[PDB]
Amino acid sequence: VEELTEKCSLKTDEFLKAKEKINEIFEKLNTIRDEVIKKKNQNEYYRGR
Amino acid sequence: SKINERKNQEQAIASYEAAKEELGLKIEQIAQEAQPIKEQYDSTKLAL
Amino acid sequence: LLRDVKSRFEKEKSNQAEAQSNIDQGRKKVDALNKTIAHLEEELTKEM
Numbered sequence: 001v002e003e004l005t006e007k008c009s010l011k012t013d014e015f016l017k018a019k020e021k022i023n024e025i026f027e028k029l030n031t032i033r034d035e036v037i038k039k040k041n042q043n044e045y046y047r048g049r
Numbered sequence: 050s051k052i053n054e055r056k057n058q059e060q061a062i063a064s065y066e067a068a069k070e071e072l073g074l075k076i077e078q079i080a081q082e083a084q085p086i087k088e089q090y091d092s093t094k095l096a097l
Numbered sequence: 098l099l100r101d102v103k104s105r106f107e108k109e110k111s112n113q114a115e116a117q118s119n120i121d122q123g124r125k126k127v128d129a130l131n132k133t134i135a136h137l138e139e140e141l142t143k144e145m
Contacts, residue, residue: 034100039105042111058127062120069116076109083102090099096116 003105024116038104038107045108051130051137055127055130055134058123058130062123062127065116065120065123069113069120072109073115076106076113079102079106079109083099083106085101085107086102
């Protein structure tokens with residue numbers, strides 16, 4: 001049961017780490033998309049200029 | 050001829066300086082209006 | 098909405114920085130031209 005508690009704790013830790021990593025990857029993709037949209041706004045403003 | 054070139058360049062620089070002062074006030078007010086939008090976004094994200 | 102307003106604020110800030118850089122470039126160019134005209138205007142006119 002102490003081994004089960006350690007196994008449940010490590011599985012929850014791995015689930016939290018995997019979810020945090022995938023959420024951070026999704027947020028990094030969102031930030032990259034935002035940076036690309038900002039660069040597109042800069043590009044369209046440069047095209048307007 | 051060079052005085053005339055300097056005068057038109059100085060006029061352009063003065064126009065750019067006037068634009069800079071007015072645009073600085075405009076960006077300041079735009080940021081002041083934008084900050085509540087960021088606060089509302091943070092509150093919406095926390096609620097979601 | 099936050100993204101567009103922040104992009105607009107950042108584009109306005111980039112325009113402000115570009116206006117400041119343009120003012121600095123224009124003022125340095127006008128100062129160089131003013132220095133050249135100041136060196137040439139008093140080359141022989143002061144004695145006269």
